[PDB]
Amino acid sequence: TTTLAFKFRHGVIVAADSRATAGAYIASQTVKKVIEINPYLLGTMAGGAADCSFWERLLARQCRIYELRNKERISVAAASKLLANMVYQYKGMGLSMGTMICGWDKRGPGLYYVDSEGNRISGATFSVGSGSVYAYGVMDRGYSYDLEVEQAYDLARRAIYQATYRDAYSGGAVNLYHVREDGWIRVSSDNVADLHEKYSG
């Protein structure tokens, strides 16, 4: 398991693996951990399957209720905020959820990071998972705010390539979405073996 997301000049970069195993046994390699919240909001599956699936579906539910009642698109701080309010109710009760919350704001890019321990923050770069520190190595190496679109594509694509490369728990497909001002855009979903024939030489 390894995901990452970072905002820059032109929206936000969303990247993930697709490997979900079961202990030492591979369950699947095609797990779309980036749960698409809205045409304007995206979330991650970072620890917990029914936690992120349920609770992010309940959050997308609640934002839909918000937009119906107020006729108004919600802010990402409000969504991560009330998400943390919902997760906080079961503190210490054995629930893993450390997801990333991504979208667009009237104040610009929307990037928030919420854990099951009430670790709701904002920031600029995030990486979650087993091989997350790998992606802090390569991503925090190659990070700049003024990077371009394909530049950040090969940056984060390289980053998942390294993190899935050293991690035995990360692999499968390389999911890659791109949050814009108007709304996100699916970039690609690439194989690590294709990035190994591509990136090995």
Binding site: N70, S75, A77, K81, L82, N85
Partner: protein, 239 residues
């Protein structure tokens, strides 16, 4: 069929107690309120000091959030319940979501609670009508009115109490588009409405303004005396 219980309807389907709740609203004190393009402004009339008491406790205009401005109609203490209730509510919305609390949401709260409060049994409904001024969404000036039935409703200008259709007809005879974005002409508009008060006593007028980013600014009855001075002077210009 009778003018008793809030539950039954007339043979043509009416709620006489809602209608009677509108009566003490119509027999209440008069207050006016307009939005400027930036400087929203309002003011109650009929201060009516009686020589032996303090009047900071009888202040009929307050704020739930700093972006919003409170007024009401009818009686006082039920509106005090609604005000402190909506301090808990606006502060709770503040606690849940870190947004500035919006006028549309809080008026859905007040009109909704007044509605279901009117639905519930053996409970005397609120005989008030609130006037809610908020310039929040990039300071976009908004003013809402409520109803004893509990219907929140936006206007562009407002006047309540006795003669609300009279002073409202004055605002129909005064609704210039240039009164806003010349916030001093909005000041002359507020002095025009307080000039068109049912008594227009000059000392019983209490006005409060906000430039959509400032706080609730309370005026003085010498600046307002200068506003009656320029009002009578402009009337001399009309002469």
């Amino acid at each position: 069929s009778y003018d008793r219980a809030i539950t039954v309807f007339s043979p043509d389907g009416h709620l006489f107690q809602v209608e009677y709740a509108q009566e003490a609203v119509k027999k209440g004190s008069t207050a006016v309120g307009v939005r400027g393009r930036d400087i929203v402004v309002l003011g109650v009339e009929k201060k009516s000091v009686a020589k032996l008491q303090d009047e900071r406790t009888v202040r009929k205009i307050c704020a739930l959030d700093d972006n919003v401005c409170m007024a009401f109609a009818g009686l006082t203490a039920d509106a005090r319940i609604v005000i402190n209730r909506a301090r808990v509510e606006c502060q709770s919305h503040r606690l849940t979501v870190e947004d500035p609390v919006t006028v549309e949401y809080i008026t859905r709260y007040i009109a909704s609670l007044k509605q279901r409060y009117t639905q519930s049994n053996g409970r005397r409904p609120f005989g008030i009508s609130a006037l809610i001024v908020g310039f929040d969404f990039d300071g976009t000036p908004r003013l809402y009115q409520t109803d004893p039935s509990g219907t929140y409703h936006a206007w562009k200008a407002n006047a309540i109490g006795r003669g609300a259709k009279s002073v409202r007809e004055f605002l129909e005879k005064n609704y210039t588009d240039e009164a806003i974005e010349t916030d001093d002409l909005t000041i002359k508009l507020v002095i025009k409405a307080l000039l068109e008060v049912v008594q227009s006593g000059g000392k019983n007028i209490e006005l409060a303004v906000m430039r959509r980013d400032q706080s609730l600014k309370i005026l003085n009855p010498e600046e307002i005396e200068k506003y009656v001075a320029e009002i009578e002077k402009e009337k001399e210009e009309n002469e």
